[PDB]
Design a binder for this molecule. Sequence first.
Ligand SMILES: *C(=O)[C@H]([C@@H](C)O)[C@H]1C[C@@H](SCC/N=C\N)C(C(=O)O)=N1
Ligand SMILES: [Cl-]
Ligand SMILES: [Cl-]
Length: 261
Amino acid sequence: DFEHAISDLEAHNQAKIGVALVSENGNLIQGYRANERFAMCSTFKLPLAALVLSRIDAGEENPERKLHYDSAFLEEYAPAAKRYVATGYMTVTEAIQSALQLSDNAAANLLLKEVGGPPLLTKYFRSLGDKVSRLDRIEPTLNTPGDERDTTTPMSMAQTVSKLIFGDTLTYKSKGQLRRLLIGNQTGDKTIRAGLPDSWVTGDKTGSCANGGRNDVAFFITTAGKKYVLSVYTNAPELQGEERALLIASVAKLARQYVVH
Ligand SMILES: *C(=O)[C@H]([C@@H](C)O)[C@H]1C[C@@H](SCC/N=C\N)C(C(=O)O)=N1
Ligand SMILES: [Cl-]
Ligand SMILES: [Cl-]
């Protein structure tokens, strides 16, 4: 069974693995450590992008709005922001695309400023019925034992993402935009979607975090038209990076045994 298979993976890789596979409507299909906390150092950007789109939906923001910043605002991993910084700004749209598809840290910080900071994103999680996920600090500060700051659970994240991608909190327009952006993610070619058939439509947001953290949350649609979200959080400090991605792809190959192909 699923729980024994993931346990075997933990023991073989000296890793901690948390995973939830949920239906289109957020209902759990299989999981393993599904209600344990993991650091949410990058995957928070997915719900962050959705908050920004929902502000646009409500007329409180628009896509072409210029988010001003200078070199002091740069972070160590900010490939897009470093290219645009001489101009003085990134638009809302550029920052959303960069934070999602490149996991650009300065772009994510721009979007955090836009929405009112970590507390307003936490309020957004709560508003969507996610009682667990919380963001407290900005990049890269958000990345000790017992500290619940900047954490999610595999279940909370899968459920949240399922609501954003497949539910009705975003308009049809925004939901389409968010999905197309996630499909075009550039950082997830070796993670969850490497463990799924290539004919399935898949979009994802990855993360790489302290203590050997390598995470991915994806939506996918099988050739039968059946829609799912898979969250995978891993800590495998003895594995190399290519091996950590392969571990996530292995988890997805296990989880897909439980979906209608
Ligand atoms: C999440 O947003 C990560 C933050 C915490 O740095 C970010 C890092 C990239 S991994 C490649 C960059 N290497 C060193 N900093 C990442 C991602 O690709 O998902 N997320
Ligand atoms: Cl369902
Ligand atoms: Cl993450």
